Amino acid sequence: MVLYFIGLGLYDERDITVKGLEIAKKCDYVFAEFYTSLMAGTTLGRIQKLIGKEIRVLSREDVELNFENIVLPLAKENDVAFLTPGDPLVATTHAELRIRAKRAGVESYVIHAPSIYSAVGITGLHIYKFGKSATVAYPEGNWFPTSYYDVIKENAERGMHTLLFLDIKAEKRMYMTANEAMELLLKVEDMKKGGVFTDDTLVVVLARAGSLNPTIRAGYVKDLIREDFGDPPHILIVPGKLHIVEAEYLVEIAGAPREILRVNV
């Protein structure tokens, strides 16, 4: 009679919370999705081992089109768990799954876990200063999407930081790198010429948030576009004007150039 939406956290199998692990161990069935994101620091096997339950993996279609036929039926007579990387309900289409649950006479509860939305605080940028977020998508054929460029523009105009998620193709396990995202943005700037993203733009790169040894780098595009940030996934952040305290952290912790203390403050 109960469906538990349980977050797996940021990077590996230990990023799930104590509450989440125990509840998962008490469930009769366990489902999971790895299409919105992937636990780059672990494997399905390790997650299964830690929880001690077999895990039924669901595709994007299984979820969006048949959640009520695959997951909800079982939850009507048992305790069911639905695991997602990060914090449940952050992925924009997940909140609606609780509506489906209610409609099926199934109670649902949410077990939170660390999300990149809050984890980016490790960059030293004040969380309250972040504005609208966007995802950088690869162009395709005749389609050249650039909305993410406008998001950066509207945020920075008001001193707000912009968190940029990078395109990902889970099935094919192909991630977009920060370096690639920067190239794309430089190309979008050359078209809209709005003075939003150039070689002189300051950016921050966060890789492997959640691991004990994440990669936090800050600096100008011209110096980071070819730098090696390590294994995916990467997160790109275009900061707005900085509070001196944020700048001091980027310099001391993310190896940013002293220059930002006078140029971006």
Place this chain on the structure above:
Amino acid sequence: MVLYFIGLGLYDERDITVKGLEIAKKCDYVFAEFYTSLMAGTTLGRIQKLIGKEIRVLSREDVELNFENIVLPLAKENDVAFLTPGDPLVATTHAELRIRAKRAGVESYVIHAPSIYSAVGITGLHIYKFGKSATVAYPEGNWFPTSYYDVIKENAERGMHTLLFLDIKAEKRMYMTANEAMELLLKVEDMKKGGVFTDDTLVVVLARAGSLNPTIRAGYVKDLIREDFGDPPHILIVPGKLHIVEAEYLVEIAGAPREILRVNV
């Protein structure tokens, strides 16, 4: 000789990540602060009992002025942990403490935990749509804070939602309720008359996120300003233009008036 910043999560001791627990159990000394937020579902004892360590609670002064004199000295010879509610670097000034660690020659690591910043996803509101955030601070003496009103106005104009952290006076065990925040906002509206926050403004209240049965309510100020949302902590959210699915969730899950389903595109 290392310093670990470890988040405890939203509501109780089980909101700590598995990683956080394992590492905290093997630390020589454990410090913590409980003034930046309220974990309504647990006690120091339970947390100590969980990690199996005595915990020295530090006041805002001990931290902001003597962190390098109380905590860092031990981190040079032992493995020290600093515990905080939610995620340690979210809506706090704790990030700067890492700079102090560096300067004292102490290596530091950050272990995230569920934060209210991502937990807002449980309101049905698309998290990528949130704009700049703010805090509704209690007026003191003749000083009446009002900046948070402009943040709401600025976000709303661009169709972005606004997350409002609520004030806390730890040493007085006082935690601002969404009701109090609403009253303060109406007073500011009367003072500025921008038409930003009135009796007809739709708002969302999330209380005790992290608990199994949080209070999630959405509706017009006039109807919610006096409603009982339960014990703190509370956060108030002023949504911007809603997507149809956000509205459906607010109505089906947060009990919002069916009329909000009719969005003015």
